[PDB]
Structures are given as C-alpha cells and as structure tokens.
Paper text:
The genome of C. divulgatum encodes three GH1 enzyme candidates, from which CIB12 and CIB13 were heterologously expressed and characterized. Purified CIB12 and CIB13 were crystallized using the sitting-drop vapor diffusion method, and their crystal structures were determined to 2.55 Å and 2.22 Å resolution, respectively, by molecular replacement (see the section “Materials and methods” for details). Both structures revealed a classical (β/α)8 TIM-barrel fold with a spherical shape, which is typical for GH1 enzymes and is one of the most common protein folds. In the retaining catalytic mechanism of GH1 hydrolases, one of the two glutamates acts as an acid/base catalyst (Glu204 in CIB12 and CIB13) and the other acts as a nucleophile (Glu388 in CIB12 and Glu385 in CIB13). In this work, two representatives of glycosidases of GH1 family from C. divulgatum were characterized. Both CIB12 and CIB13 were active against cellobiose and lactose but showed substrate preference to cellobiose, and therefore were identified as cellobiohydrolases, EC 3.2.1.21.
In addition, the CIB12 structure contains two small antiparallel and one parallel β-sheets and six short α-helices, whereas CIB13 has four antiparallel β-sheets with two β-strands each and four α-helices outside the barrel structure. Both CIB12 and CIB13 structures revealed the presence of two protomers per asymmetric unit forming a dimer with interacting residues located primarily on two C-terminal α-helices, one side β-strand, and connecting loops. The cleavage of the glycosidic bond involves the formation of a covalent glucosyl-enzyme intermediate, which is then deglycosylated in a hydrolysis reaction via the attack of a water molecule producing the free enzyme and glucose. Both active sites show the presence of an additional area of electron density in each protomer located near the catalytic glutamates: Glu204 (3.9 Å) and Glu388 (2.8 Å) in CIB12 and Glu204 (3.5 Å) and Glu385 (2.8 Å) in CIB13. In CIB12, this density was interpreted as glycerol (two molecules in the CIB12 dimer), whereas the CIB13 dimer contained one molecule of glycerol in one protomer and one molecule of tris(hydroxymethyl)aminomethane (Tris) in the second protomer. The glycerol molecule in the CIB12 active site was also positioned close to the side chains of conserved His148 (3.1 Å), Trp149 (4.5 Å), Tyr321 (3.9 Å), Trp426 (4.1 Å), Glu433 (2.9 Å), and Trp434 (3.4 Å). Additionally, both active sites contained several aromatic and charged residues, which might contribute to substrate binding including Gln16, Trp30, Asn203, Glu207, Tyr341, Trp362, and Phe442 in CIB12 and Gln16, Trp30, Asn203, Phe340, Met357, and Trp359 in CIB13. The crystal structure of CIB12 also revealed the presence of the disulfide bond Cys172–Cys212 located near the active site, which is not conserved in CIB13 and might contribute to a higher thermotolerance of CIB12 activity compared to CIB13.
Author numbering: 1 to 160, 167 to 484
C-alpha cells in the first residue's frame, strides 16, 4: 500500500482549463498564437479556440465533486499571470542588484506589494481565492503554479518566428513582482508553491535557435526567474517552493551509449537543478564563451538551495542516439513513437493517441534518477495519456502507479501523485483532439462523463494502493 495520507489528485493549467463558459482572457501570447491564421494553415496550431474549452473557471465546484467522488485529495492549480496583472507592472520599480549579467538580487518589499495592489485585478484574485477555498475546504492538498507557458501580452507579443515566450532580464523582474504578489495573498493557503511548469519545454521551443549554447542561456534566464522569485516568495510564505519539470526516461539506443544518456540528462535537466540547488552554472559559463556573451560567477549562492521540492512529470521514455557532436530522439519509441506507427512502438508496446509509447517502468526510472541525485521531497505532478475511448488508460494508470509504488519503497520521498488530468483539456498546438482526462468533456454541451479509468482511481484511492484484484491491469508491457 501507499504511505499514509498519500496525495492522489489532478493537475490543471489555466490556459488549458479555465475558458469555455465566461470571462474570456485574450491577454496571453498563447491565445494569439492559437488564433493566428498563418499558424493554423501551416499546422503550428490546430485552430481550435481555447475560449470554447472546459469552462473550469466557472464549473470548478462540479469538477471538484467528481474528483471527490473518485477519492482524490489533491490538486495542482495554475494561476494565470494575464488575469492577475492584465496591465504592465514596469512602472513599479524595484531594487535590482546585478553583476556580469547575472541578476543576483531583486528586493521585493511591502511597499512594492501595495504598489502592485493598485494594478492587480482584485476580481481575478477573488475568483482564484474561491477556487483555492473550494479545494482546501474539502481538506485537500493545494499546489499553486505561477507560470504555465501562457504569458501576458505586455510581457511577450507574438505579433510585432517562434512563440517567443522565453525569459529575458525584463521578464524576470516583472515575474518576481507577480511571484511575490501571489505568495503575499496565498502564502497561508497554498500547501506548496511551484514557480513554473515545465520550463525546459519553454526555452526549448520558444525560439528558433535550437543550438545547445543558446538553449542554456535561455535556461539561465529561467534559472534566475525561480531563484529571485523564491527569495521574494519566502518573504511571505513558509511553504515548500519548487519547480514542476518536464521529464522523460532518457535511454540510449539499446543502452549502448550510457554516457550520451547522462549527457542528455545534464543538458536538459540536471544543469537546471544543479544551479538552483547548488549553484553549478559551469554549463552557462561554458556556453557563454563560444557566444562572446558576458558571464559571471561559476558558483552563485544567489541561485543555490532554491528548491524545496521537485514536481516530476512523466508520460513516456526518451530514447536518444548520438549523431554528429549531437543527439537525436529515436523516432518510433518514446515521445517520438508516432512517426513509424500509431499503434505499436519498435519495442512492440502500445502508443498513446498523441504518439507517446506506454512505458510504465520509466516512472520508476525517472523518480529514481531524481532521488539518487538530490534526495528531496518530490511529487508526480503530471502522469497520464491521450485516450478518448479509455482503451489503455485503465492499464496505464495501474501499471504506472505500481512502478511508482516500487519507487516509494526504494526510498523516494514522493508524497503525491497528480494525474494529468481530471478532465480533458486544450492540448496547446494540438487542440482538444488529445483527451487526457479521467473524465471526458463534451465541448459542445460542457457535460462531464466519467471514464472507466476514473473508477479505477476511485478503487485505488479507497484502498490507498492497488488491491490484488487490480494487479492484472498493472502489467508493465501491453
């Protein structure tokens, strides 16, 4: 069985869930990126309208009742920066200490909070408060996520060749203001804070520059985005602040190149977490040389010890092969399976309706690698699959939860599992075609439909683990 009071719940993004019924928010870069006609006919976005979505902004108490019925006791909710501060906060100046380009200090004091108090949407603050109160009044675990890809238009405007939602110096200063603002009013409500959701996915896709060097100075801006935030938030909250990260079980092509595996894991993830926990930015300096861009200290205590917990996201593995001084995701396996077949992988394993092969052993592998390197409290903040007819999700949920249970027993300090997701939602560039929910949403009528896999969650939550009668669904390979 799982540990006592283990957290079974769901994760939610503001842009993917909120809109659909009322209170349309058009003030995000992703909204215009979704509606751009050239992006539609060039197959960058699906063309689906996010304002025709789940309606979680208004229907959240009824969707929370369904989570309660299936025994959930946790929720990860993302706050939209566009709704709290719909207008620019640049006019509010703050003390900013820098050196050779590294933002070492952003002093957010209480005279800044009341200054930001006049520009904030007090009605949007009350709506999020009502959503969070609806979660905590049921005795549930609450995790607030500040940033989930969508950025206010005054921060980034795709109008005026990628989305461009990266971080720069001016974006970091404004973000720490909004980060400290959230911790000022919700520091006693949120059980844990997450500054950003999958930032590695952002600075990988936010620019046409896929070079390793520019990838890491982009990551650098996100590194300071959390480090300077964490400082400002901890002024008003006593709760664990961490990062929700995109992860895949990195593997070499047939385990012949284990050094390339550790190469990939350091370039994409462990460079980030070694800076925010220890201060190792030798990657950032190593990059900054071949760029002729100014670099600072290689070990910065402004960045270090800035992770109280890690939000692990896992969906599939990631098999890679060395090319020329580089690596390539092997098509036909892992996240890149949907290129040789949409029904079976090269390993002969089932594939999700979005092209990601089902590899339940990877949720043990990714949790173990994170624990064996840092040993902090962790959480599965996202885990699920695109499966409309519920063909594979019942076996997906059980098999992954038992590989995670194998991880808890082996020492991993994971105290929560947040399935993605309770309901279907807007899967960004692919629209509503990708249905990840334990319950299915009819976007024409906004009606909620329980999928059978949601009743499997009801059985696991009731027993705090997988009973013997559900072990056949837990088979890893199918």
């Amino acid at each position: 069985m799982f540990p006592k009071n283990f957290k079974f719940g769901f994760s939610e993004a503001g842009f993917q869930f909120e809109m659909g019924v009322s209170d349309i928010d058009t003030n995000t870069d992703w909204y215009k990126w979704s509606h751009d006609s050239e992006n539609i006919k060039n197959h960058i976005v699906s063309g689906d309208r996010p304002e025709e979505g789940v309606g979680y902004w208004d229907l959240y108490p009824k969707d929370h009742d369904l989570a309660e019925y299936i025994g959930m006791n946790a929720a990860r909710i993302g706050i939209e920066w566009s709704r709290i501060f719909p207008v620019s906060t640049e006019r509010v100046t703050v003390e900013v200490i820098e050196e050779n380009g590294d933002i070492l200090e952003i002093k957010i004091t209480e005279k800044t909070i009341k200054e930001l108090d006049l520009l904030s949407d007090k009605n949007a603050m009350q709506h999020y408060t009502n959503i969070f109160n609806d979660i905590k009044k049921r005795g549930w675990f609450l995790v607030i996520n500040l940033f989930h890809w969508s950025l206010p238009l005054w921060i980034n405007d795709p109008s005026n060749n990628a989305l461009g939602n990266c971080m720069n110096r001016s974006s970091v200063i404004e973000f720490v203001k909004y980060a400290a603002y959230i911790s000022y009013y919700f520091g006693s409500i949120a059980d844990r804070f997450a500054t950003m959701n999958e930032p590695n996915e952002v600075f990988k896709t936010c620019s046409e520059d896929k070079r390793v060097e520019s990838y890491h100075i982009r990551m650098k801006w996100f590194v300071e985005a959390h480090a300077r935030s964490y400082d400002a938030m901890k002024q008003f909250t006593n709760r664990q602040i961490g990062v929700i990260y995109a992860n895949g079980d990195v593997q070499s092509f047939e385990n012949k190149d284990p050094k390339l595996k550790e190469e990939v894991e350091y370039e994409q993830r462990y460079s980030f977490f070694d800076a925010l926990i220890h201060g190792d930015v030798h990657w950032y300096v190593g990059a900054c040389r071949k760029t002729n861009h100014v670099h600072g200290k290689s070990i910065r205590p402004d960045l270090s010890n800035r992770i109280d917990w890690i939000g692990v996201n896992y969906y599939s593995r990631n098999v890679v092969k060395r090319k020329e001084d580089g690596y390539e995701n092997v098509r036909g396996l892992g996240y890149d399976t949907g290129w040789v077949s949409y029904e079976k992988s090269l390993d002969g394993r089932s594939v999700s309706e979005t092209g990601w092969e089902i590899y339940p052993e990877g949720i043990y592998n990714i949790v173990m690698s994170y624990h064996k390197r840092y040993e902090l409290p962790m959480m599965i903040t996202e885990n699920g699959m695109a499966d409309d007819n519920d063909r594979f999700r019942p076996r997906y949920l059980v098999s992954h939860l038992k590989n995670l249970e194998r991880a808890i027993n082996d020492g991993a300090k994971v105290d929560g599992y947040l399935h993605w997701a309770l309901t279907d939602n807007f899967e960004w560039g692919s629209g509503f075609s990708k249905k990840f929910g334990l319950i299915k949403v009819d976007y024409k009528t906004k009606k909620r439909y329980l999928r059978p896999s949601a009743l499997i969650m009801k059985e696991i939550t009731k027993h705090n683990g997988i009973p013997e009668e559900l072990e056949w669904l837990g088979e890893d390979k199918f």
